[PDB]
Design a protein around this motif. Structure first.
Motif, short mmCIF file in Angstrom:
data_model
loop_
_atom_site.label_atom_id
_atom_site.label_comp_id
_atom_site.label_asym_id
_atom_site.label_seq_id
_atom_site.Cartn_x
_atom_site.Cartn_y
_atom_site.Cartn_z
N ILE B 19 29.81 111.20 -20.56
CA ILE B 19 29.65 109.76 -20.48
C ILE B 19 29.31 109.11 -21.81
N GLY B 20 28.40 109.75 -22.53
CA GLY B 20 27.92 109.19 -23.77
C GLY B 20 29.01 109.02 -24.80
N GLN B 21 29.65 110.13 -25.13
CA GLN B 21 30.57 110.17 -26.26
C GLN B 21 29.93 109.49 -27.48
N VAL B 72 10.75 103.58 -15.84
CA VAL B 72 11.00 104.48 -16.96
C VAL B 72 11.83 105.64 -16.44
N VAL B 73 12.83 106.00 -17.22
CA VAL B 73 13.75 107.06 -16.86
C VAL B 73 12.94 108.32 -16.58
N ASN B 74 13.43 109.12 -15.67
CA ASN B 74 12.70 110.30 -15.18
C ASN B 74 13.32 111.63 -15.61
N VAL B 89 17.17 117.31 -18.54
CA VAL B 89 17.82 116.82 -17.33
C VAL B 89 17.16 115.57 -16.77
N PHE B 90 17.91 114.46 -16.67
CA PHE B 90 17.37 113.20 -16.11
C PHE B 90 18.01 112.74 -14.81
N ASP B 91 17.26 112.03 -13.98
CA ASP B 91 17.85 111.32 -12.83
C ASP B 91 18.99 110.44 -13.39
N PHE B 92 20.17 110.50 -12.78
CA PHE B 92 21.31 109.72 -13.31
C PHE B 92 21.23 108.23 -12.94
N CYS B 93 21.62 107.35 -13.85
CA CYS B 93 21.64 105.91 -13.59
C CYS B 93 23.05 105.36 -13.77
N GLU B 94 23.52 104.62 -12.78
CA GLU B 94 24.89 104.16 -12.72
C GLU B 94 25.28 103.23 -13.88
N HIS B 95 24.42 102.27 -14.19
CA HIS B 95 24.75 101.24 -15.19
C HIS B 95 23.94 101.34 -16.46
N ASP B 96 24.41 100.67 -17.53
CA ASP B 96 23.50 100.31 -18.60
C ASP B 96 23.70 98.87 -19.05
N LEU B 97 22.59 98.15 -19.22
CA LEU B 97 22.58 96.76 -19.56
C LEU B 97 23.60 96.35 -20.63
N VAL B 142 18.59 100.23 -21.98
CA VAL B 142 18.06 99.75 -20.70
C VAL B 142 19.07 100.09 -19.61
N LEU B 143 18.67 100.96 -18.70
CA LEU B 143 19.57 101.38 -17.61
C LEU B 143 19.26 100.65 -16.31
N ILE B 144 20.23 100.59 -15.40
CA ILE B 144 19.96 100.10 -14.04
C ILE B 144 20.61 101.02 -13.02
N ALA B 153 15.08 103.74 -21.28
CA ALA B 153 15.65 105.06 -21.54
C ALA B 153 15.56 105.41 -23.01
N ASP B 154 15.92 106.65 -23.35
CA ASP B 154 15.99 107.06 -24.76
C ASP B 154 14.67 107.00 -25.49
N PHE B 155 13.83 108.01 -25.28
CA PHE B 155 12.53 108.08 -25.97
C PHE B 155 12.57 108.97 -27.21
C1 LIG Z 1 19.99 107.74 -25.59
N1 LIG Z 1 21.14 107.82 -24.77
C2 LIG Z 1 21.05 108.25 -23.39
N2 LIG Z 1 20.61 109.52 -22.95
C3 LIG Z 1 20.67 109.59 -21.46
C4 LIG Z 1 20.24 110.81 -20.70
C5 LIG Z 1 21.16 108.35 -20.91
C6 LIG Z 1 21.38 108.09 -19.43
N3 LIG Z 1 22.55 107.53 -19.01
C7 LIG Z 1 22.76 107.30 -17.69
N4 LIG Z 1 23.99 106.67 -17.25
C8 LIG Z 1 24.90 105.91 -18.10
C9 LIG Z 1 25.91 105.09 -17.55
C10 LIG Z 1 26.82 104.38 -18.38
C11 LIG Z 1 26.71 104.50 -19.76
C12 LIG Z 1 27.67 103.76 -20.61
C13 LIG Z 1 25.73 105.35 -20.32
S1 LIG Z 1 25.58 105.54 -22.11
O1 LIG Z 1 24.20 105.64 -22.47
O2 LIG Z 1 26.26 106.71 -22.60
N5 LIG Z 1 26.19 104.17 -22.77
C14 LIG Z 1 25.21 103.44 -23.35
C15 LIG Z 1 25.34 103.46 -24.86
O3 LIG Z 1 26.71 103.17 -25.30
C16 LIG Z 1 27.70 103.98 -24.57
C17 LIG Z 1 27.51 104.05 -23.08
C18 LIG Z 1 24.83 106.05 -19.48
N6 LIG Z 1 21.85 107.66 -16.77
C19 LIG Z 1 20.67 108.22 -17.16
C20 LIG Z 1 20.40 108.47 -18.53
C21 LIG Z 1 19.13 109.05 -19.02
N7 LIG Z 1 18.13 109.51 -19.42
S2 LIG Z 1 21.47 107.32 -22.10
#
Ligand SMILES: C/N=c1\[nH]c(C)c(-c2nc(Nc3ccc(C)c(S(=O)(=O)N4CCOCC4)c3)ncc2C#N)s1
Lengths: 252, 309
Positions: B19-21, B72-74, B89-97, B142-144, B153-155
């Motif tokens: 997801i990150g890339q 706060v992310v878990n 390993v973190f609880d997954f979050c669908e969105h990011d702000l 900031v995730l949602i 997120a991201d500490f």
């Molecule tokens: C510091 N970066 C992160 N590390 C982790 C474990 C993150 C995270 N992400 C999700 N879901 C989620 C969903 C969509 C996206 C786009 C992304 S993304 O961080 O890769 N993104 C934001 C920055 O620019 C590219 C896209 C993450 N859930 C939980 C965690 C955690 N911890 S973010």
């Protein structure tokens, strides 16, 4: 859990090391030795007593999971100390830890050419061990520092500088000398050390006007019965340890 | 082979998608092989690590272990590989702000924007109360969750603080970096995170980072063109920073925070709160406690739950 690193006496008897044929007596030695080595290295590396204590706890816990027959203290100690110093924010360089460990274990021997294959190996060995320690502890490195608890107790009992200094002595010695940290919470250990230091200095703590004893203001669980059993155990091992008691002995 | 009760192999999770890339590397979405529970995996990168296990990763781990809060992310656990590698390993979050905001289809009501800011400020209150500075506030961190719960997120750049402090100055993304840091401060605290909360709040309407500098000087210029210019009158003692004059700040500029954002925001209370977040003197900048108390969160439309994403 919270109880994850706390063991019953029955559990301490059935240690990984016992399972490989190591006497209970021999094992307590192996621990005391490791804690000596940690103390020695830590003093030369100029790290805090807090950092050394962390490394000793790491050690104590590591050996509730791994056996001394497979991982010798002289290998673990330096790795544990390396890690504890990083965690406590006093990082020491890998080369430096290796060097100090070398002099400690082999005072006469000559340091290897840092260019050598033999030396490159031992660098690599320490890093491997740190990693095995990390995984053994399941990455739980935040330790409750017991000295903090002692200071607090000696305030509650309005101890003299001397009484407090002796309580801290009892505290540091309990980690090197006993598995109390594996069995009892830091606050309870603190009470034990203060109890014994009073007994030794022949100080008496006044029964509250409520008729309530001090340690009650420190940990609910704690009882005089438990404290006497523990201070006795701690005193006997102090008595076994040459010169240790001399340091707190009123020579006048 | 060595016993290892408390560190499971990451293969228990099944990799779904990189997801990150990100230049930050690398976050994977993954699926627990037995229960289907979604998680996020981050490998600890050991590319330039000559000092064993990275002290930086130890710090982050220590912090994630301490911080337990709805906003706060878990961190679930740390996993090994069985070679050799390590994964948070973190609880997954669908969105990011940052994603939601750059998505033209996505739309926020005033009520939801209120809710977002409420959760964010509540997370900040928690982390600060626990002596942690986040140091990397930005929309992308900031995730949602699928159920509308916001998580900071991201500490990886976070750090504990205390009680004259000598903390690292080059913290925080340039666009979100507060004046203090840009003027060379090393004795900073929670107010740096709040400045970031400000920039993010404004971003909830502008749909885009308000102050996109290219260098520190450009950034400091942009900030002056919005908040007025850094003056010992406005910011008592700002002069004692070495770079204050040694960095030719502008001189005519006046506060345009409410004027320039007046367009996008509309709501008086929202504008007032943003104005109190983007305050120059860190010591006069509103804190999470007072921010939470601001009339913005206590007037109609009252804050509401999150929906359509
Ligand atoms: C510091 N970066 C992160 N590390 C982790 C474990 C993150 C995270 N992400 C999700 N879901 C989620 C969903 C969509 C996206 C786009 C992304 S993304 O961080 O890769 N993104 C934001 C920055 O620019 C590219 C896209 C993450 N859930 C939980 C965690 C955690 N911890 S973010």
């Amino acid at each position: 859990n919270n109880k994850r690193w706390y063991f019953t006496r029955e559990q301490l008897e059935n240690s990984p090391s016992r399972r490989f044929g190591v006497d209970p007596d021999k094992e307590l030695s192996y621990r005391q030795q490791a804690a000596n080595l940690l103390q020695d290295m830590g003093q030369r590396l100029n790290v805090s007593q807090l950092t050394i204590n962390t490394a000793i706890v790491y050690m104590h816990r590591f050996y509730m999971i791994q056996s001394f027959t497979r991982f010798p203290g002289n290998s673990v100690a330096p790795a544990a100390l390396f890690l504890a110093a990083k965690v406590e924010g006093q990082p020491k360089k890998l080369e430096h830890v290796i060097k100090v460990a070398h002099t400690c274990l082999h005072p006469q021997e000559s340091l290897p050419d840092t260019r050598s294959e033999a030396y490159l190996q031992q660098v690599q060995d320490l890093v491997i061990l740190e990693s095995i320690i990390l995984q053994t502890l399941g990455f739980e490195l935040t330790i409750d520092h017991p000295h903090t608890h002692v200071v607090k107790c000696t305030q509650l009992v309005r101890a003299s500088k001397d009484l407090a200094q002796t309580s801290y002595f009892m505290a540091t010695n309990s980690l090197h000398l006993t598995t109390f940290s594996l069995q009892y919470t830091p606050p309870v250990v603190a009470c034990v050390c203060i109890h014994l230091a009073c007994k030794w200095s022949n100080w008496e703590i006044p029964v509250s006007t409520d008729g309530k004893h001090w340690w009650e203001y420190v940990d609910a669980t704690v009882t005089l019965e438990l404290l006497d059993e523990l201070t006795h155990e701690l005193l006997q091992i102090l008595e076994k340890t040459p010169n240790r008691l001399k340091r707190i002995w009123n020579w006048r | 082979s060595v016993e290892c009760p408390f560190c499971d192999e990451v293969s228990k999770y099944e990799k779904l998608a990189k997801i990150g890339q990100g230049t930050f590397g690398e976050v994977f979405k993954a699926r627990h092989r037995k229960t289907g529970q979604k998680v996020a995996l981050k490998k600890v990168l050991m590319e330039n690590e000559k000092e064993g296990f990275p002290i930086t990763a130890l710090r982050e781990i220590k912090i994630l272990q301490l911080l337990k809060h709805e906003n706060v992310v878990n961190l679930i656990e740390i996993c090994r590989t069985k070679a050799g590698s390590i994964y948070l390993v973190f609880d997954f979050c669908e969105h990011d702000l940052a994603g939601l905001l750059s998505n033209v289809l996505v739309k926020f009501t005033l009520s939801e924007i209120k809710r977002v800011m409420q959760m964010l400020l509540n997370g900040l209150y928690y982390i600060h109360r626990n002596k942690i500075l986040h140091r990397d506030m930005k929309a992308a961190n900031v995730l949602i969750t699928r159920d509308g719960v916001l998580k900071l997120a991201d500490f990886g750049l976070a750090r504990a603080f205390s009680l004259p402090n000598r903390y690292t100055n080059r913290v925080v993304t340039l666009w979100y970096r507060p004046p203090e840091l840009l003027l060379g401060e090393r004795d900073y605290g929670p107010p740096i995170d709040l400045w970031g909360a400000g920039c993010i709040m404004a971003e909830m309407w502008t749909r885009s980072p308000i102050m996109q500098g290219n260098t520190e000087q450009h950034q400091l210029a942009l900030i002056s063109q919005l908040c007025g210019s850094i003056t010992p009158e406005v910011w008592p003692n700002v002069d004692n920073y070495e770079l204050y004059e040694k960095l030719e700040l502008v001189k005519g500029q006046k506060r345009k925070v409410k004027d320039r954002l007046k367009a996008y925001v509309r709501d008086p209370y929202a504008l007032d709160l943003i104005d109190k977040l983007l305050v120059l003197d860190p010591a006069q900048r509103i804190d999470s406690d007072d921010a939470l108390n601001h009339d913005f969160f206590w007037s109609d439309p009252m804050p509401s739950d999150l929906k359509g994403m």
